[PDB]
């Protein structure tokens, strides 16, 4: 067979140990999910806006008493209500409080006032993967594999908790000081033991079955991994066009083209992740995540060493000290005004 006795016994034991880890991880998650205003706004100096969404913004802050820097996500409650994202916001906070994994951002404080909701999480200083990818152009296959292996482990973890992530893309991946990935946004994540039906995600990363308005499962995350690996290694995604509707036609077509510089191992992995047919997509078969982790393209990956953050990163971002923001673009700075009247109090009672 492909493995001799020694390799086969090593692999089997490794897979069993993953099961034991994930079982303990699930037990810890549920305890924290069952039993979760831990700061206030004048506890922080606001320094600079790090990113923006329709919700509000993410700002670098310094915790006054301790001097530590954090990223503070500020959500305008009235905007959240108008955007119909009440449940997303409460769910994101609930996930972030409960999960624990080396590539998932750590929430430190959360609180609210009359106008806004605040999520204070670890500051990830190395910038968006998106910027690094567009600047470098494309990542070498070893560089892409280092990142990909972190997403595989992160999805292995989230899926064992029955969480589908649903918004993988370089824009949602930050690089920390050691060159490792941090995931921070869980606004579309959902606990899905079986199937779910919501049309959500980003057009280039949508699995066909989402586009086709089907009931779908965690395999959409493995499709999105294929898109991500492709984009990291090519510098552009497998399916693009002027308008989303044309991107969708390409996604559902079953056809994908690869740059000539893609290795054969990479193309094979990608054809199995970017598989329209759910009965054949890697990550969705009887062998589970093992089809991905044991694929030839990952043969050089020491999965435990990645988890332990003992692999030397291929790229270490510029770090000029704490509170340095040079890896982030400049955003227009608004003002965090706090109304004298409580807004949307009932809707966000549990926050």
């Amino acid at each position: 067979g492909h493995m001799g006795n020694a390799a086969a016994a090593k692999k089997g034991s490794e897979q069993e140990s993953v099961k034991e880890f994930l079982a303990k991880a699930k037990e810890e998650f549920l305890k924290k999910w069952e039993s979760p205003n831990t700061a206030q706004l004048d506890h922080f100096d606001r320094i600079k806006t790090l990113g923006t969404g329709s919700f509000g913004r993410v700002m670098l802050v310094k915790h006054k008493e301790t001097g530590n820097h954090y990223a503070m996500k500020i959500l305008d409650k009235q905007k959240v209500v108008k955007l119909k994202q009440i449940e997303h916001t409460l769910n994101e906070k609930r996930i972030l409080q409960a999960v624990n994994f080396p590539f998932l951002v750590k929430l430190e404080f959360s609180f609210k006032d009359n106008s806004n909701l605040y999520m204070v999480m670890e500051y990830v200083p190395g910038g968006e993967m998106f910027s690094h990818l567009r600047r470098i152009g494309r990542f070498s296959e070893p560089h892409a594999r280092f990142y990909a292996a972190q997403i595989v482990l992160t999805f292995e973890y989230l899926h064992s908790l029955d969480l589908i992530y649903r918004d993988l893309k370089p824009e949602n991946l930050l690089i920390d000081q050691q060159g490792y990935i941090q995931v921070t946004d869980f606004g579309f994540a959902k606990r899905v033991k079986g199937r779910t039906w919501t049309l959500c995600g980003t057009p280039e990363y949508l699995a066909p079955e989402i586009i086709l308005s089907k009931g779908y499962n965690k395999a959409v995350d493995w499709w999105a991994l294929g898109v991500l690996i492709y984009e990291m290694a090519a510098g552009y995604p497998p399916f693009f066009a002027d308008q989303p509707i044309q991107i969708y036609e390409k996604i559902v077509s079953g056809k994908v083209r690869f740059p000539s510089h893609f290795s054969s191992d990479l193309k094979d992995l990608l054809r199995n992740l970017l598989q329209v047919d759910l009965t054949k997509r890697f990550g969705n078969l009887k062998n589970g995540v093992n089809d991905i982790k044991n694929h030839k393209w990952f043969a050089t990956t020491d999965w435990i060493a990645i988890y332990q953050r003992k692999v030397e990163a291929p790229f270490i971002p510029k770090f000029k000290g704490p509170g340095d923001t040079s890896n982030f673009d400049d955003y227009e700075e608004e003002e965090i005004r706090v109304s004298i009247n409580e807004k949307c109090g009932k809707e966000f009672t549990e926050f």
Binding site: E128, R134, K169, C200, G201, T202, P203, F240
Partner: peptide, 19 residues
């Protein structure tokens, strides 16, 4: 080239989720 086609799509910047 395919890269040129990607540029021509205008979706080379940060992409929003659908809404």
């Amino acid at each position: 080239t395919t890269y040129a086609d990607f540029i021509a799509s205008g979706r080379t910047g940060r992409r929003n989720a659908i809404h």
